[PDB]
Curated annotation (Swiss-Prot):
Domain of life: Bacteria
Subunit structure: The RNAP catalytic core consists of 2 alpha, 1 beta, 1 beta' and 1 omega subunit. When a sigma factor is associated with the core the holoenzyme is formed, which can initiate transcription.
Function text: DNA-dependent RNA polymerase catalyzes the transcription of DNA into RNA using the four ribonucleoside triphosphates as substrates.
Positions spanned in the full protein: 158 to 209 of 1356
UniProt-recorded name of the protein: DNA-directed RNA polymerase subunit beta
Native organism: Caulobacter vibrioides (strain NA1000 / CB15N) (Caulobacter crescentus)
Family affiliation: Belongs to the RNA polymerase beta chain family.
Lineage: Bacteria, Pseudomonadati, Pseudomonadota, Alphaproteobacteria, Caulobacterales
Amino acid sequence: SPGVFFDHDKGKTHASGKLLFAARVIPYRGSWLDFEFDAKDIVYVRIDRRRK
DNA sequence: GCCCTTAGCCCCTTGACAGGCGGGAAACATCGTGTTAACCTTCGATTAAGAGTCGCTGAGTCGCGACG
């Protein structure tokens, strides 16, 4: 369904054991947006999972 | 019972078509060109809600020493 999503990572793709909390808003028709974090504790706008 | 004579079958010679592949000659549908010059000189999708790993790159941290 269209709307913002916050998929907290379950440890996978983490530095050691930390979570990611990828805040992604899925539009009904358009380009996806990802506001996930990293091990450096920084929010990166991974638009449509292309770049970070 | 054997030899002569004649009939039937097989074979040869000619032939009057019949039309039949096929190139030619011709009537007709293709296939690659042109050519015209009145106005816009960045078009657009598409992953991206699982998962084990190959191949490369570029930042922050240290040694060895020289010159005051």
